[PDB]
DNA sequence: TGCGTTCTAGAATATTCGCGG
DNA sequence: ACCGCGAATATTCTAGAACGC
């Protein structure tokens, strides 16, 4: 599993980040509750940038889609099912 | 068991090196906690060099893989390596680790 | 503060690192201007690299050097050379090419 | 024939920028 | 500003290759 996916799983799963990024209620998507604080305070703790656009570029590269707080989903990104991450293949 | 693996086992297992190189908390991988001091103060006591890169090349020659460190963005952090046959309390598995041949 | 806008960031930053005097404690031209020296690989990687790049790994700095065609000149300084990386000849930087595998 | 050290390269992922809309 | 996406470069991790023993 590439670093982006395992870090993203950790971010969403960990409760100590839940003020800015968390599973949706049913566990099928994740929410960014405060984009600006997420990008300025959380992104540089796990990635080499503080740029929401570079996070979103990676979401696109891994096939995530925005859901109509911002919400993203991937069929193989589900609460309690980290074994499924191996199914997610980055775009070339 | 070639010298690299027995020396690596002793390095990880020994408590007195644990500031530099230690089992991870699950015992399925090992950590190098201070890469610079490990390379300059530990490596040349066990090997003919003081270069982390030459240690790392050997780790990969023996089939070890680097573990992603989750909380690494932006006092250097740990580096973690794992091998299915390098496990705390299971030194009987070391004989199964065969170096790649060039 | 690097400033060679016409070449990739790595070469512009490398030129500034070598040329600027306040970094000469870490990285500087060799005496004849034909190569550059990293004087203390440990201090350079920990104190200088993350001020200019998104990492503090000598190996990733060296990967870039080789990718742009630099060769190591074979404890102490490490020395790297490129025919087109030369003191007083910044017009040659744009002849340095990034290798493609 | 195999192991150790060094230097360089392959390939994948990661970050940024810019384009058209 | 967004949004999807191509492209250039950066960074990481592993491997190739030369050479000594
Ligand atoms: Na969370
Ligand atoms: Na130890
Ligand atoms: Na300098």
């Amino acid at each position: 599993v590439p670093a982006f996916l395992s870090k993203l799983w950790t971010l969403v799963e960990e409760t100590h980040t839940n003020e800015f990024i968390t599973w949706s209620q049913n566990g099928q998507s994740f929410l960014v509750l405060d984009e600006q604080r997420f990008a300025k305070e959380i992104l540089p703790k796990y990635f080499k940038h503080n740029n929401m656009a570079s996070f979103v570029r990676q979401l696109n590269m891994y096939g995530f889609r925005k859901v109509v707080p911002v919400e993203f989903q991937h069929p193989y990104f589900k609460q309690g099912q980290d074994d499924l991450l191996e199914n997610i293949k980055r775009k070339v």
Side-chain angles (χ1 to χ4, degrees), chain A:
Chain A
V1 177
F4 176 77
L5 292 173
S6 60
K7 286 170 176 194
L8 179 61
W9 175 272
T10 299
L11 279 172
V12 175
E13 191 90 295
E14 287 320 300
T15 52
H16 73 268
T17 59
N18 270 359
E19 319 92 303
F20 307 139
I21 182 161
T22 185
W23 287 111
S24 64
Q25 318 198 129
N26 68 3
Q28 307 307 297
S29 55
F30 74 90
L31 294 321
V32 181
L33 305 178
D34 185 335
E35 284 188 84
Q36 291 191 19
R37 287 196 67 180
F38 174 76
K40 198 169 179 54
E41 302 169 47
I42 303 295
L43 283 180
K45 189 153 149 172
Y46 296 81
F47 306 104
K48 297 173 178 279
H49 64 82
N50 63 352
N51 187 351
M52 186 64 70
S54 296
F55 180 67
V56 166
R57 189 74 196 82
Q58 284 274 75
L59 290 174
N60 172 277
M61 291 297 290
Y62 283 95
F64 285 78
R65 291 182 160 255
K66 203 169 207 171
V67 180
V68 86
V70 311
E71 184 170 3
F72 293 94
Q73 65 83 13
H74 193 292
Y76 286 116
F77 194 80
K78 302 303 171 214
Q79 182 173 34
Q81 302 202 66
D82 63 317
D83 53 294
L84 294 175
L85 293 177
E86 63 186 273
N87 291 289
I88 301 171
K89 296 311 198 296
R90 202 176 182 253
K91 282 200 246 297
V92 307

